[PDB]
Design a protein around this ligand. Sequence first.
Ligand SMILES: CC(=O)/N=c1\sc(S(N)(=O)=O)nn1C
Ligand SMILES: [Zn+2]
Length: 257
Amino acid sequence: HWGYGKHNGPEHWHKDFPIAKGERQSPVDIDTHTAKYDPSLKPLSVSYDQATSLRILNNGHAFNVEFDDSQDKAVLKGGPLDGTYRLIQFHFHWGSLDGQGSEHTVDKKKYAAELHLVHWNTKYGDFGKAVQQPDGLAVLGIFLKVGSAKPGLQKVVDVLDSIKTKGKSADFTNFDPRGLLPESLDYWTYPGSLTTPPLLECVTWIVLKEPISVSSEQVLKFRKLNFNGEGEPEELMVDNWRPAQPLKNRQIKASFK
Ligand SMILES: CC(=O)/N=c1\sc(S(N)(=O)=O)nn1C
Ligand SMILES: [Zn+2]
């Protein structure tokens, strides 16, 4: 099965998922000098005050925090989007070292980790239908850099012990994802794909320009997770990121000048 090790990592995915070599794959490098300011772009509208987190799960590739998405509780609108997108889960990608870990890069700069808030277009009725549509998902990407601790992340960091191996989950209620947002919502946007298999090209990416900072100690706790399941050989969950893919026929737009 696919993963991030040397025999089954990203450069192998195309043998099982040939869309890996598609025209609108993610992530990409954001060249800040060739991105186009588009004043047609609206501000983002993040409405997370009624969010209901349910659970945190180690799925063998990352950990996900899952939300109740059976109603318009936590939604994303505005920006380049049409319609209403519901939050279903968030997860991170991170590195073995502080100089790598993010999926997107900015003028080839890598960050220590990248947060993905995944949302699906309610007009398609459920997540599984949405991933079949070119406008079905909107993923908010936020970079993490190492510096001062992020207090709103510590609830997540503290439970990681209880989901160390693949397939473990824990109740994770009353977590407020607003505590993970930077001060500014300026962004870049481009049409792209999921960054793990099945690599479907159904995502409007919205990548925030301002990183959040987390402490060394917080990211170190990410690095103690396991890709393996309980009882199996320990393989630390690190470097679960996909490298930048060719931009091909796409334009990155910026909401700011
Ligand atoms: C969110 C979900 O159910 N799946 C995902 S989200 C995703 S990501 N990385 O955000 O692009 N990749 N995949 C396969
Ligand atoms: Zn992701």
